[PDB]
Amino acid sequence: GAMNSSNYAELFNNDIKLFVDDTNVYRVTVHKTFEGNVATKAINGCIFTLNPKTGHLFLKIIHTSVWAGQKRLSQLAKWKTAEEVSALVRSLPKEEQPKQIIVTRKAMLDPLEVHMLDFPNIAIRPTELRLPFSAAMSIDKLSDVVMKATEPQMVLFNIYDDWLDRISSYTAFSRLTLLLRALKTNEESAKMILLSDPTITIKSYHLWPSFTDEQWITIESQMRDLILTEYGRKYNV
Amino acid sequence: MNTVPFTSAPIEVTIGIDQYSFNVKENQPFHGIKDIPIGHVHVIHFQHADNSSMRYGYWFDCRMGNFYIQYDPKDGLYKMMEERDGAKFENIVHNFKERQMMVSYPKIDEDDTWYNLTEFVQMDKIRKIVRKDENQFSYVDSSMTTVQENELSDPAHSLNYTVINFKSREAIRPGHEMEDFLDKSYYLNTVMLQGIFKNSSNYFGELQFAFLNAMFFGNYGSSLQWHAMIELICSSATVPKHMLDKLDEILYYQIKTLPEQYSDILLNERVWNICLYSSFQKNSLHNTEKIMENKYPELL
User: Fold this and answer.
1) Which terminal Cβ of chain A has fewer Cβ within 10 Å, N or C?
2) Residues B227 and B255 in one domain
3) CATH code assigned at B291
4) Does the A9-163 domain belong in CATH 3.40.228.10?
5) Considering the domain A164-237 in this protein, what is its CATH number?
6) CB of A119 less than 8 A from some CB of B
7) How is B12-62 classified by DSSP, letter by letter?
8) Residue A76 at interface with chain B, using a CB cutoff of 8 Å
């Protein structure tokens, strides 16, 4: 059934699985028209397809041309997400295809189920987890490749950099959800923390700074604080 | 006007004939039902006084042979059987009529209710849904499951309704996933009407048989088939005008006839709210929407 805190270790077993997050597929700026009406202008989007075990991110860039002349865009975005995920699965060798796809939003279940009819043994699951994958576009290199794209593109990243050399997939996913939760709650504060010291750099082939195990503790500590500050304000408690 | 004689009534029982019912006392001198209208399918149905569980009955047409009811004290139920000896049957019926041991099918002359509920139901189509080819009549009860309920476990006691599944390769064309899921017109018109049913008359016959089985026997899988067949039309953007007009009339008489007190278990809130208020045909069922709102505003 639904993925929750009760079955959280299933994420790091040796059954191939993928999270799908559609919250940055259809993105708009709302603006005023010359006649003083309101209008939307689409920007490039992306599907966030992650293996939580490996950190292998399949970033399908959704170029604004896909929306041209189409109606009910937020509905179409779910179906276009499920089309692209179905296309990714079919493109992988059998031994690489997932056994489970966990959608981060229940509205993606029927579209994904219908696009995956051809794959009856792949389980489409919702989650009760509130995952901060929306903040994926606060990661500078992911934001850059989406916004530069002039056509539909798939870009492959490892969202854990080289962390799996030193830490387990459970600990890598926890670190990643803490960074994304921080970037989602206060993007300015989160980025300040990550780059406040000039001597710690991001390798060309990486997304996050090259922190030592000690520096990661300090960083993780600073991110936890930032999330509570903001929570203590939102709710004045 | 045709007759279904009863050999006897050894156990106390509520006897149904179509939309009517009569209580018979244990060993009451009851010998059957006369004046049964020729031209329609009929259903004779039973609910024992001692065990008010397992409603069961027989679908029959009097044109297709001479049928009687005889209690079997081994299997503990009223059985339908065919009498092949025409002169023996007429001799039995005439005797019981002379002795006035038979209730008359109590049809009011103005009242088209049974005709309206059975308009498209044909014995030949019932005998393909209820497979038992050595009998001209069909046995249904409360508990019988559908071919579809079995897949999701005795094939010979199954109701073989047409399987409808909105998230099936049958319902969804590769490359038209969103189109076909949101607008069932291809599934309704090409796959079900042209391909499987051949015409709307066969589709409506099965829908009406499904309803009557739900109503008379509280057959759950029958209720599911009735709603699925309503949803498939209502969820289609493109439906022949004559089918929408006819569906409105069919549904009106099913809602009109439904015992007021069973609407909680016999009617599916999600399906009815969608069909009347959200679907492509939200504006296309005036009669059904007006009776539903006046008789069952709770559900909506």
Assistant:
1) C
2) yes
3) 1.25.40.550
4) no
5) 1.20.80.40
6) no
7) -EEEEETTEEEEE-TT----EEEEEPTTS-EEEEEEESS-----EEEEE-G
8) yes
* DSSP letter (8 states) at residue B162: P
* Burial (Cβ within 10 Å: 0-12, 13-18, ≥19) of residue B228: buried
A117 touches chain B (CB under 8 A): yes
Asked if A117 lies within 8 A of B168 by C-beta distance, the reply is yes
Residue B194 and residue B136 share a domain: no
With 0-12 / 13-18 / 19 or more C-beta atoms within 10 angstroms meaning exposed / middle / buried, residue A214 is exposed
Check CB contact under 8 Å for A111 and B167. Answer: no
* CA A237 to chain CA mean position, Å: 30
Q: What distances in angstroms separate CA B260 from CA A110, B134, B219, one per listed residue?
A: 35, 38, 17
Specify the experimental method: X-ray
Question: Same domain, yes or no, for B200 and B299?
Answer: yes
Chain A residue at shortest CA distance from B170: A117
Asked if residue B212 and residue B83 are part of one domain, the reply reads no
**Could you tell me the strand order of the sheet in which B42-48 lies?**
B20-24, B13-17, B42-48, B56-60, B138-141
Q: Are residues B127 and B225 in the same domain?
A: no
**Resolution of the experimental model, in Å, one decimal:** 1.5
User: Are B262 and B287 contained in the same domain?
Assistant: yes
HEC string for A79-132:
HHHHHHHHHHHHHCCHHHCCCEEEECCHHHHHHHHHHCCCCCCCEEECECCCCC
Q: Searching chain A, which residue's CA lies closest to the CA of residue B179?
A: A79
Whether residues B35 and B62 share a domain: the answer is: yes
DSSP-assigned beta bridge partners for residue B59 = B43, B138
With an 8 Å Cβ cutoff, is A120 touching chain B?
no
Nearest residue in chain B measured CA to CA from A75: B178
Count of domains for chain B: 2
**B167/A115 CB distance under 8 A:** no
Of B116, B143, B170, the residue that ends a domain is: B143
Secondary structure string (H, E, C) spanning B186-243: HHHHHHHHHHHHCCHHHHHHHHHHHHHHHHHHCCHHHHHHHHHHHHHHHCCCCCCHHH
| CA triple B223-B229-B230, angle to 5 deg | 90
What is the Cα–Cα distance from A83 to B179, expressed in whole angstroms?
12
Return all residues near A75 (Cβ < 8 A) that are at least 6 apart: none
Question: Touching check for B181 and chain A: CB below 8 Å?
Answer: yes
Closest residue of chain A to B165, computed from CA coordinates: A114
Looking at the structure, tell me whether residues B137 and B152 fall in a common domain.
no
Q: Does B87 touch chain A (CB under 8 A)?
A: no
Question: B143, B160, B194 — which closes off a domain?
Answer: B143
CATH number at residue B105: 2.60.34.20
Beta bridge partners of B252: none
Domain hosting B97: range is 1-143
3-state secondary structure of A25: coil
